[PDB]
Ligand binder design. Structure first.
Ligand SMILES: [Fe+2]
Ligand code: NA
Ligand code: NA
Ligand code: NA
Ligand code: NA
Ligand code: NA
Ligand code: NA
Ligand code: NA
Ligand code: NA
Ligand code: NA
Length: 187
């Protein structure tokens, strides 16, 4: 439980394997460690594989079963759907640029427009936390000029979740696909 500053991304990953050695999760400690890692672009350039038309998800580490660690690359104007996190912890650390995070309440069964509960601006090196009990969220790169890169950790890992229609609150099941794994493009 002695948390040291991650010197490198590699160091971060090693520390993460220690924090997730057990069955439970100290959320505040994982968040503090993620925040303490100073983004060094050279260290994660291998995973920063962008697509022109939407954001990409690039697997960095499989966390020996307990978590997925991955890097998301957001072109100018790229955003996600409103989604849940499948009963997992979600950690989001900015490695480059800014993201807008918008929070939504779980919809009632009546068809209604989903209204924003709040929004915030995540900035370089900041780490945010989300879970289903906090709410639904959307993540967007609203920048016209700057690509964004984020580091995402999910525990337990999941490759399916729901997307929500902002107009109705209706949900559909969605399968997450990896654009690359361990620096290897995986079509
Ligand atoms: Fe998310
Ligand atoms: Na490294
Ligand atoms: Na560091
Ligand atoms: Na992209
Ligand atoms: Na997108
Ligand atoms: Na992807
Ligand atoms: Na940005
Ligand atoms: Na947003
Ligand atoms: Na959620
Ligand atoms: Na990768």
């Amino acid at each position: 439980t002695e948390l040291l500053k991650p010197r490198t991304l590699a160091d971060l990953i090693r520390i993460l394997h220690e924090l997730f050695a057990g069955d439970e999760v100290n959320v505040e400690e994982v968040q503090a460690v993620l925040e303490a890692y100073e983004s060094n672009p050279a260290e994660w350039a291998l995973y920063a594989k962008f697509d022109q038309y939407r954001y990409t998800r690039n697997l960095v580490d499989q966390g020996n079963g307990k978590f997925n660690l991955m890097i998301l690359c957001w072109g100018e104007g790229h955003g996600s759907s409103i989604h849940d996190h499948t009963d997992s912890h979600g950690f989001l650390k900015l490695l480059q640029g800014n993201l807008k995070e918008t929070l939504f309440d779980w919809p009632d069964k009546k068809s209604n427009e989903m209204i924003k509960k709040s929004e915030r601006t995540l900035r370089e090196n900041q780490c945010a936390y989300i879970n289903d009990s906090i709410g639904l969220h959307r993540v967007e790169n609203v920048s016209h000029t700057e690509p964004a890169v984020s580091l995402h950790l999910y525990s337990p890992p999941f490759d399916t979740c729901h997307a929500f229609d902002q107009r109705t609150g209706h949900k559909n099941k969605v399968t997450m696909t990896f654009h690359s794994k361990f620096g290897i493009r995986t079509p």
